[PDB]
Amino acid sequence: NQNAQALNTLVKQLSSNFGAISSVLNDILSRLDKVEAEVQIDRLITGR
Amino acid sequence: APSKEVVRFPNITNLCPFGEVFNATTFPSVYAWERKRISNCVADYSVLYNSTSFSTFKCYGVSATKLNDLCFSNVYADSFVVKGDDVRQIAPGQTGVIADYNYKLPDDFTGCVLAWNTRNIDATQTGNYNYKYRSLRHGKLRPFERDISNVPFSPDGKPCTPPAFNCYWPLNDYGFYITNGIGYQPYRVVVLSFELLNAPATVCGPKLSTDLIKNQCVNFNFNGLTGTGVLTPSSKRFQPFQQFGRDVSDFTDSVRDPKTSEILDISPCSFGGVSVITPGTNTSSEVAV
Amino acid sequence: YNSTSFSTFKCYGVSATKLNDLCFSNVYADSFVVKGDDVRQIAPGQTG
Amino acid sequence: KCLDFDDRTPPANTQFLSSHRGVYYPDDIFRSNVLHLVQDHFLPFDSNVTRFITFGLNFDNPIIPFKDGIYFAATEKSNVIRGWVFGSTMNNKSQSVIIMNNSTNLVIRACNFELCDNPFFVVLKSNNTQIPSYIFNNAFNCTFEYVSKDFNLDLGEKPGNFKDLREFVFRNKDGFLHVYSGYQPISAASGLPTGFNALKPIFKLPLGINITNFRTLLTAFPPRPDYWGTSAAAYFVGYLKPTTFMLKYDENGTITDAVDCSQNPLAELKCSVKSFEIDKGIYQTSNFRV
Numbered sequence: 085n086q087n088a089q090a091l092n093t094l095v096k097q098l099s100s101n102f103g104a105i106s107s108v109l110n111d112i113l114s115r116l117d118k119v120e121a122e123v124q125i126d127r128l129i130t131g132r
Numbered sequence: 133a134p135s136k137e138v139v140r141f142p143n144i145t146n147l148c149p150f151g152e153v154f155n156a157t158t159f160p161s162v163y164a165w166e167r168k169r170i171s172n173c174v175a176d177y178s179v180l181y182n183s184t185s186f187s188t189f190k191c192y193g194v195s196a197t198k199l200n201d202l203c204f205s206n207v208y209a210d211s212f213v214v215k216g217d218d219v220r221q222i223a224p225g226q227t228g229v230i231a232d233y234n235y236k237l238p239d240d241f242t243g244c245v246l247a248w249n250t251r252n253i254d255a256t257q258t259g260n261y262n263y264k265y266r267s268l269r270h271g272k273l274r275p276f277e278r279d280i281s282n283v284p285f286s287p288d289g290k291p292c293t294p295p296a297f298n299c300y301w302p303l304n305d306y307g308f309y310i311t312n313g314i315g316y317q318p319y320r321v322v323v324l325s326f327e328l329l330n331a332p333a334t335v336c337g338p339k340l341s342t343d344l345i346k347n348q349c350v351n352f353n354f355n356g357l358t359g360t361g362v363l364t365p366s367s368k369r370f371q372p373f374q375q376f377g378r379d380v381s382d383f384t385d386s387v388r389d390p391k392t393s394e395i396l397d398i399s400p401c402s403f404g405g406v407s408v409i410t411p412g413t414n415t416s417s418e419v420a421v
Numbered sequence: 422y423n424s425t426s427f428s429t430f431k432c433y434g435v436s437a438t439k440l441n442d443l444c445f446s447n448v449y450a451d452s453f454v455v456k457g458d459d460v461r462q463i464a465p466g467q468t469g
Numbered sequence: 470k471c472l473d474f475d476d477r478t479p480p481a482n483t484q485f486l487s488s489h490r491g492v493y494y495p496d497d498i499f500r501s502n503v504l505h506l507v508q509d510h511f512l513p514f515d516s517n518v519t520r521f522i523t524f525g526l527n528f529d530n531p532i533i534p535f536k537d538g539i540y541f542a543a544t545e546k547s548n549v550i551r552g553w554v555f556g557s558t559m560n561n562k563s564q565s566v567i568i569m570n571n572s573t574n575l576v577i578r579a580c581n582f583e584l585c586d587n588p589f590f591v592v593l594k595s596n597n598t599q600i601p602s603y604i605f606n607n608a609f610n611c612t613f614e615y616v617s618k619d620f621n622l623d624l625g626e627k628p629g630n631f632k633d634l635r636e637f638v639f640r641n642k643d644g645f646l647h648v649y650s651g652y653q654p655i656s657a658a659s660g661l662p663t664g665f666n667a668l669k670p671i672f673k674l675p676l677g678i679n680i681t682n683f684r685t686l687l688t689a690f691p692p693r694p695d696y697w698g699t700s701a702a703a704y705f706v707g708y709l710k711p712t713t714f715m716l717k718y719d720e721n722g723t724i725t726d727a728v729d730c731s732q733n734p735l736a737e738l739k740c741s742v743k744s745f746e747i748d749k750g751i752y753q754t755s756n757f758r759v
């Protein structure tokens with residue numbers, strides 16, 4: 085159960101914004117150009 | 133790696149009413165600003181290039197260079213006229229007479245602000261006093277809320293009659309003259325507000341749709357939401373007000389086709405563990421996988 | 422609001438919408454005149 | 470013209486509980502087989518709801534404050550409740566919006582209404598025909614107008630218990646009046662039936678109006694051309710508060726249950742562990758908050 089729960093919480097943590105406008109990479113890359121997208125994606129990369 | 137491109141936008145044939153909004157014959161006062169809904173059209177704003185020059189163009193929540201590749205939900209255009217000095221107040225987080233008592237933008241505004249000088253038509257040699265703004269009010273307006281009441285104002289907050297010494301009418305008239313300075317010249321402002329990638333949309337950028345390819349890794353663009361994945365038929369039943377579906381990870385895992393209304397599941401292209409067995413690079417360059 | 426119209430109004434270290442709810446320490450007002458082109462220079466980090 | 474009902478018993482403002490009603494869909498994203506935590510303006514579980522009735526000498530249509538959005542339930546059997554007026558001053562000095570079923574269309578109009586102090590529709594028991602009535606005396610600054618597709622409402626008093634429970638949630642935010650709605654068949658003689666029913670979005674009106682008060686629109690049943698009467702109907706009003714809810718999406722993607730995290734320590738524990746089922750034991754919860 086501990087192993088399964090660790091993996092499942094890892095999966096669920098992908099939904100957490102880390103100070104970024106959204107946790108969905110595709111949404112960010114669809115709305116924002118290279119620079120602002122880079123800022124948001126850097127936040128997401130740090131969090132993940 | 134994806135090999136093909138799928139683009140699915142809804143059946144839209146008409147151009148958006150750029151001439152009706154940005155080229156209207158009359159504009160409201162800022163205190164009585166008017167809102168107009170926009171739907172079922174192509175937002176090919178390059179047509180504006182030949183007709184309109186914008187002193188101010190600022191977009192929030194979206195990059196200016198992505199507008200051509202998106203579809204917009206709940207599109208509204210708010211139109212009014214202000215002073216040149218007051219144009220800076222049409223933006224989130226501002227203070228001043230306009231942002232306090234006439235027109236307030238939300239902190240989380242998504243959309244764009246366009247302003248352009250209108251001295252030639254909105255100003256006269258004799259002075260045009262048709263445009264107004266509220267100069268006194270008991271408290272500040274809430275975002276996107278309107279107050280067109282005209283009742284006498286008293287700073288003590290009691291019923292009022294104009295003659296009394298502590299009594300003022302709360303609406304002031306802009307005086308727009310031809311010989312005015314740039315800060316006292318009329319500017320027409322259009323605020324476009326919309327949501328982008330969370331609901332059905334009927335206003336779309338000028339893009340060409342392709343055939344729906346299924347069971348193949350593709351680069352897809354559904355109503356402006358881009359990604360890479362494999363599309364399959366879905367058993368999910370979306371409500372009419374739902375356009376996208378998300379899993380526990382917030383990944384967009386389903387979508388309703390804009391044209392056929394079919395529900396399609398989206399899956400990642402990459403999958404499966406791989407390992408490499410080697411006897412040592414010095415011994416050999418042959419590997420097993 | 423009734424007397425002055427400001428071409429430029431920029432606040433640093435504080436949000437314009439909170440000014441009504443604060444008390445200010447050691448308040449000073451520096452006053453001068455410049456060219457229109459030079460107004461942009463009245464800001465931190467400028468050169469000219 | 471505007472008619473006044475004389476010798477009306479004052480509203481009693483009887484109090485009941487809301488049980489688990491008032492939940493609506495927080496967004497437009499499809500979800501299924503998932504527990505979703507969301508903070509928003511919800512009606513807290515088992516909150517106080519005020520009842521207003523039309524029966525006998527009671528014609529309860531007072532001005533009720535809006536506060537931060539409301540939940541409005543209607544228990545009826547003869548379609549007595551027809552709509553609402555939302556506004557601030559409830560007169561022609563400010564903008565108001567009327568939402569009403571006039572027995573053939575749904576009409577939403579935002580103008581400067583010279584609202585009648587006693588606005589109502591009129592239905593004749595003799596042959597169940599609605600007669601033209603007055604909801605307002607005048608209107609001149611209309612900013613929003615909407616008329617739906619034609620239909621036919623079933624007029625006429627009916628016997629038995631209340632059969633229809635119609636629920637609405639009204640929320641004014643960022644210049645939009647959000648209206649969520651839901652229907653339920655009931656067989657209740659009186660009171661607000663206990664249960665759960667997720668409300669779906671039906672309107673997002675771009676009104677941009679300052680809304681602080683509202684008054685329900687009802688229909689009177691005059692027995693004679695100069696006297697006023699009433700048929701049985703009831704409605705209930707409750708107030709939304711900012712709070713955190715854990716919603717449950719089932720296989721078809723419908724909200725079938727919810728937990729109000731602030732109701733009691735057990736609900737807080739359920740929201741923290743993200744599950745409707747808690748095992749036996751002792752669990753640390755939030756420190757005592759005031």
Ligand SMILES: *[C@@H]1O[C@H](CO[C@@H]2O[C@@H](C)[C@@H](O)[C@@H](O)[C@@H]2O)[C@@H](O[C@@H]2O[C@H](CO)[C@@H](O[C@@H]3O[C@H](CO)[C@@H](O)[C@H](O)[C@@H]3O)[C@H](O)[C@H]2NC(C)=O)[C@H](O)[C@H]1NC(C)=O
Binds near residue numbers: 584586607
């Ligand atoms: C806005 O509405 C007011 C009336 O007051 C409003 O409506 C009521 C039904 C209530 O809901 C009030 O709370 C609400 O404020 C209009 O003022 C009224 O105008 C009428 C028509 O001109 C006046 O009638 C006249 O009054 C006198 C005698 O009393 C004589 O001149 C005439 O014989 C005639 O009866 C009425 O007095 C006046 N006041 C009231 C209290 O009704 C107001 O005109 C309207 N504003 C508009 C239409 O712009």
Ligand SMILES: *[C@@H]1O[C@H](CO)[C@@H](O[C@@H]2O[C@H](CO)[C@@H](O[C@@H]3O[C@H](CO)[C@@H](O)[C@H](O)[C@@H]3O)[C@H](O)[C@H]2NC(C)=O)[C@H](O)[C@H]1NC(C)=O
Binds near residue numbers: 609
């Ligand atoms: C809301 O409704 C009120 C009441 O009808 C409107 O006020 C009215 O506006 C008209 C049009 O501007 C005014 O007419 C003009 O008024 C002056 C009189 O000196 C002058 O410009 C013209 O000769 C003409 O008569 C009218 O006086 C005014 N009425 C009142 C009682 O104030 C108001 O405009 C409406 N608001 C909106 C936002 O539509």
Ligand SMILES: *[C@@H]1O[C@H](CO)[C@@H](O[C@@H]2O[C@H](CO)[C@@H](O[C@@H]3O[C@H](CO)[C@@H](O)[C@H](O)[C@@H]3O)[C@H](O)[C@H]2NC(C)=O)[C@H](O)[C@H]1NC(C)=O
Binds near residue numbers: 271287288289558681
């Ligand atoms: C929506 O409209 C209502 C009704 O017009 C507004 O309520 C009004 O709010 C003002 C400002 O807060 C109140 O005036 C002030 O009240 C006290 C004394 O009562 C004091 O701060 C000042 O001297 C001044 O008088 C006013 O009383 C109040 N009116 C009512 C009937 O409650 C409300 O502000 C509007 N909301 C928005 C968001 O614009």
Ligand SMILES: *[C@@H]1O[C@H](CO[C@@H]2O[C@@H](C)[C@@H](O)[C@@H](O)[C@@H]2O)[C@@H](O[C@@H]2O[C@H](CO)[C@@H](O)[C@H](O)[C@H]2NC(C)=O)[C@H](O)[C@H]1NC(C)=O
Binds near residue numbers: 390391392
């Ligand atoms: C959107 O339109 C398409 C295409 O149908 C029309 O004819 C095309 C040649 C072109 O002129 C389009 O713009 C027209 O709308 C409809 O697609 C239908 O469905 C199948 C796939 O299931 C498609 O391959 C066929 O071409 C179409 N068959 C028909 C129209 O009989 C689609 O249904 C339209 N969607 C909406 C919401 O109106």
Ligand SMILES: *[C@@H]1O[C@H](CO[C@@H]2O[C@@H](C)[C@@H](O)[C@@H](O)[C@@H]2O)[C@@H](O[C@@H]2O[C@H](CO)[C@@H](O)[C@H](O)[C@H]2NC(C)=O)[C@H](O)[C@H]1NC(C)=O
Binds near residue numbers: 482483517
């Ligand atoms: C909710 O309201 C009740 C009172 O409702 C009473 O019963 C109804 C059936 C109807 O007859 C109403 O008119 C009655 O008033 C509150 O219950 C009491 O509230 C008072 C005042 O705060 C309190 O002192 C008492 O202890 C409460 N208990 C009883 C048994 O009456 C209740 O507090 C209200 N809820 C909230 C959150 O305010």
Ligand SMILES: *[C@@H]1O[C@H](CO[C@@H]2O[C@@H](C)[C@@H](O)[C@@H](O)[C@@H]2O)[C@@H](O[C@@H]2O[C@H](CO)[C@@H](O)[C@H](O)[C@H]2NC(C)=O)[C@H](O)[C@H]1NC(C)=O
Binds near residue numbers: 719721
């Ligand atoms: C909703 O889906 C169900 C099947 O899913 C189960 O029941 C749901 C209500 C919900 O509890 C899920 O988590 C469950 O897994 C459908 O139920 C059947 O629907 C058919 C018609 O399609 C009907 O004839 C059957 O009686 C239903 N009952 C069973 C036990 O299968 C239900 O129809 C779906 N709702 C719709 C289609 O509106």
Ligand SMILES: *[C@@H]1O[C@H](CO)[C@@H](O[C@@H]2O[C@H](CO)[C@@H](O)[C@H](O)[C@H]2NC(C)=O)[C@H](O)[C@H]1NC(C)=O
Binds near residue numbers: 572616
């Ligand atoms: C309910 O209201 C609607 C909308 O006002 C009425 O239908 C309108 O009637 C007016 C006045 O005759 C017409 O000018 C409009 O064209 C109608 N609009 C429609 C049909 O969409 C309808 O008659 C009303 N029903 C009643 C009073 O019973």
Ligand SMILES: CCCCC/C=C\C/C=C\CCCCCCCC(=O)O
Binds near residue numbers: 229430
């Ligand atoms: C009284 C002079 C000294 C300053 C007082 C103390 C602290 C700062 C207070 C207010 C700063 C805002 C000044 C007015 C500019 C905004 C008005 C407008 O946008 O038109």
Ligand SMILES: CCCCC/C=C\C/C=C\CCCCCCCC(=O)O
Binds near residue numbers: 469
């Ligand atoms: C000499 C031309 C090529 C540039 C030289 C190399 C690098 C960049 C050097 C300087 C940039 C500033 C130019 C002057 C503008 C600032 C002066 C002002 O604010 O008035």
Ligand SMILES: *[C@@H]1O[C@H](CO)[C@@H](O)[C@H](O)[C@H]1NC(C)=O
Binds near residue numbers: 151155
């Ligand atoms: C608005 O449209 C008319 C008609 O096409 C055109 O002549 C005019 O130039 C447009 N607006 C302006 C400000 O010129």
Ligand SMILES: *[C@@H]1O[C@H](CO)[C@@H](O)[C@H](O)[C@H]1NC(C)=O
Binds near residue numbers: 182
């Ligand atoms: C742009 O406007 C000019 C001036 O009216 C006109 O001659 C020209 O044809 C227009 N071009 C397009 C592409 O509309």
Ligand SMILES: *[C@@H]1O[C@H](CO)[C@@H](O)[C@H](O)[C@H]1NC(C)=O
Binds near residue numbers: 300423
């Ligand atoms: C604002 O200034 C005008 C123009 O001088 C004057 O008439 C009015 O009384 C002033 N209002 C206040 C509230 O000081």
Ligand SMILES: *[C@@H]1O[C@H](CO)[C@@H](O)[C@H](O)[C@H]1NC(C)=O
Binds near residue numbers: 593595596598
């Ligand atoms: C119903 O009764 C009213 C009231 O007398 C009458 O006007 C009408 O003609 C009757 N019949 C109908 C509406 O079919």
